[PDB]
């Protein structure tokens, strides 16, 4: 295991409201700046059972198709509900079908534990997924009383020292808002080098500046240092 930093990454649009040149501040569930991130090399089976306390900041650095699974669930033995998400070329396979859970999360699709009665499915076409700039892919997750929000933004990243979360502000726009009522409290990745940048979320006031193009340029965390508290 290892620990990388979280300088100025983990900011997302809290509400669905366009604002130009404003300074808004909401008590949403953001990622604390300058926090620890459980760096896991999944190159090597790195398959922990990391919890889902108030959200997660899953990120990934790969080449083509290394990490393609974010299966959820809390008591994943025989009966609990889950959220299977693969990123094949056709579309997403978002499911909530409670079924069997195999201890080996290895993947093509090879898990295929058991099929039975389901509650919801999703075959959404807008799938979640230069040469030198391989990929800087991060996926924000959060469990609310209603839908299960998923934020992500695929951006190019330069090559540098051994892979760590780079410095630079980047807002996370939402992609899917599927309704769900799951009681998930864990995490599990699927893959057939890696980052596995898991970062836990917690409530904190975040003053975020909106530009005149409807994009977040910078954001304070109001809890890091007394300077931010004054800001």
């Amino acid at each position: 295991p290892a620990y990388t930093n979280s300088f100025t990454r983990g900011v997302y649009y809290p509400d669905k409201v366009f604002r130009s040149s404003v300074l808004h501040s909401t008590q949403d569930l953001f990622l604390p700046f300058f926090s620890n991130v459980t760096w896991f090399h999944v190159i090597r089976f790195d398959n922990p059972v990391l919890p889902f306390n108030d959200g997660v900041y899953f990120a990934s650095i790969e080449k083509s198709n290394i990490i393609r699974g974010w299966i959820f669930g809390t008591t994943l033995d025989s009966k609990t509900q889950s959220l299977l998400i693969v990123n094949n070329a056709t579309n997403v396979v978002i499911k909530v079908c409670e079924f069997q859970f195999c201890n080996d999360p290895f993947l093509e699709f090879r898990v295929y534990s058991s099929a039975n009665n389901c509650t919801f499915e999703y075959v959404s076409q807008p799938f979640l997924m230069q040469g030198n700039f391989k990929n800087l892919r991060e996926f924000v997750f959060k469990n609310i009383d209603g839908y299960f929000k998923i934020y992500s933004k695929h951006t190019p990243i330069i090559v540098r020292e051994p892979e760590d979360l780079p410095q630079g502000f980047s807002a996370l726009e939402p992609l899917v808002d599927l309704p769900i009522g799951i009681n998930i409290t864990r995490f599990q990745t699927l893959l057939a080098a890696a980052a596995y940048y898991v970062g836990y979320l917690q409530p904190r006031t975040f003053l975020l500046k909106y530009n005149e193009n409807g994009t977040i340029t910078d954001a304070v965390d109001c809890a890091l240092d007394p300077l931010s508290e004054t800001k």
Binding site: Y13, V17, F18, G214
Partner: protein, 413 residues
């Protein structure tokens, strides 16, 4: 009228504000025709109990909420946050229906605030109640005793429940620190107490099928809404709009904004709706208020004349003789190229007066005469005579002392 008197003095007096009234109404709603099927809802045979809820998150439809008005007798509608008759024009985001067969006079405990046993360890609602509660007498269908074991009822729990949280449990309670290990000993049973029923039972003992469906009014794209129509969309015209429940007035022009595909509404610095997305084909609009302003009347005085002059503050003489100053559009006076002392202050250095027929004239302020005192290298101006003058100054020194009585002014006799 604005100042109660039949004899006004000479000056400028604010009276009202110029405002253009709308002349149309826009009620464009999302084009959708499917109806929410009520077969999988309370209007059905197979019902559920408080042990296992029936939560059906319905999809977009045009279901008219004024359909159950001919339901079974005694159909209470206690909407704690909305209005029952008003559920025909609001567009809700998502409706969360529910179903349970709670029995007894504890129907008042389902409403928020009450802390009864059903509200303690059988059901709970958040302190918003964004929807309504639907409860009716259920006796003709639950008269037989075969539905006793089909209608479950949980028992006390060592911890309070959570709003919108199912309480499915099948273990045995443990009082204190003595585990009874499955077998029911003392102070340890299974929270699966079955409700007892009877055909010829009492009035209060009869069960009641209660529906507590709720909503969520926020910025998310609404899915369900009442059945209404849609009209055309004007651009350069101050009219009324009802875009997706957002009711207001003002012009709806085309905006050159950059609304992201997930951003529907739009606010301003003061958190006011400045732009909205049409529920029809994607088009970015701009909600600007109607053309308003402020009026000001220039009056030379009551018993000196009967003419007035209107001053539309903040107008460019193209939004309402005519004179465009740096303070508004003065309509009723004429700008003379002369210069006199200020008599009626208006703004930007252009006062007015009632001078010679007799009409209200406008003129630039005169700061005074122009004197050119010659300055030479050797020229003194010594006076040769004195003129003693006696001026006067008016300064207040006091004020009328007043006293109030609380027990006589705030409260009468």
């Amino acid at each position: 009228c604005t100042l109660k008197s039949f004899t006004v003095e000479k000056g400028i007096y604010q009276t009202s504000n110029f405002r253009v009234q709308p002349t149309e109404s826009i009620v464009r709603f999302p084009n959708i025709t499917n109806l929410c099927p009520f077969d999988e809802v309370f209007n059905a045979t197979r019902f559920a109990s408080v042990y296992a809820w029936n939560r059906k998150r319905i999809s977009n439809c045009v279901a008219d909420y004024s359909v159950l008005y001919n339901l079974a007798p005694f159909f209470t509608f206690k909407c704690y946050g909305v209005s029952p008759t008003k559920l025909n024009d609001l567009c809700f985001t998502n409706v969360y229906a529910d179903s349970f067969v709670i029995r007894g006079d504890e129907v008042r405990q389902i409403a928020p605030g009450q802390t009864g046993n059903i509200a303690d360890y059988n059901y709970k609602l958040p302190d918003d109640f964004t929807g309504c509660v639907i409860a009716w007498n259920s006796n003709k269908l639950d008269s037989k005793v075969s539905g006793n074991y089909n209608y479950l009822y949980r028992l006390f729990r060592k911890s309070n429940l959570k709003p919108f949280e199912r309480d499915i449990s099948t273990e045995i309670y443990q009082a204190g620190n003595k585990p009874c290990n499955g077998v029911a000993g003392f102070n340890c049973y299974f929270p699966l107490r079955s409700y007892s029923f009877r055909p010829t039972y009492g009035v209060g003992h009869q069960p009641y099928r209660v529906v507590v469906l709720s909503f969520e009014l926020l910025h998310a794209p609404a899915t369900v809404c009442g059945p209404k129509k849609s009209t055309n969309l004007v651009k350069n015209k101050c009219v009324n709009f009802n875009f997706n429940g957002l009711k207001g007035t003002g012009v709806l022009t085309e905006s050159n904004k950059k609304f992201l595909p997930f951003q529907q509404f739009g606010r301003d610095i003061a958190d006011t709706t400045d732009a909205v997305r049409d529920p029809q084909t994607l088009e970015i609009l701009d909600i600007t208020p109607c053309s308003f302003g402020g009026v000001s009347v220039i009056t030379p005085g009551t018993n000196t004349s009967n003419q007035v002059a209107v001053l539309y503050q903040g107008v460019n003489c193209t939004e309402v003789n005519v004179f465009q100053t740096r303070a508004g559009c003065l309509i009723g006076a004429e700008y003379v190229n002369n210069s006199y002392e200020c008599d009626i202050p208006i703004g930007a250095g252009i006062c007015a007066s009632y001078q010679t027929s007799q009409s209200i004239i406008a003129y630039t302020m005169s700061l005074g005469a122009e004197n050119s005192v010659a300055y030479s290298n050797n020229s003194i101006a010594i006076p040769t005579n004195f003129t003693i003058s006696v001026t006067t100054e008016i300064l207040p020194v006091s004020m009328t002392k007043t006293s109030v009585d609380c027990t006589m002014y705030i409260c009468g006799d």
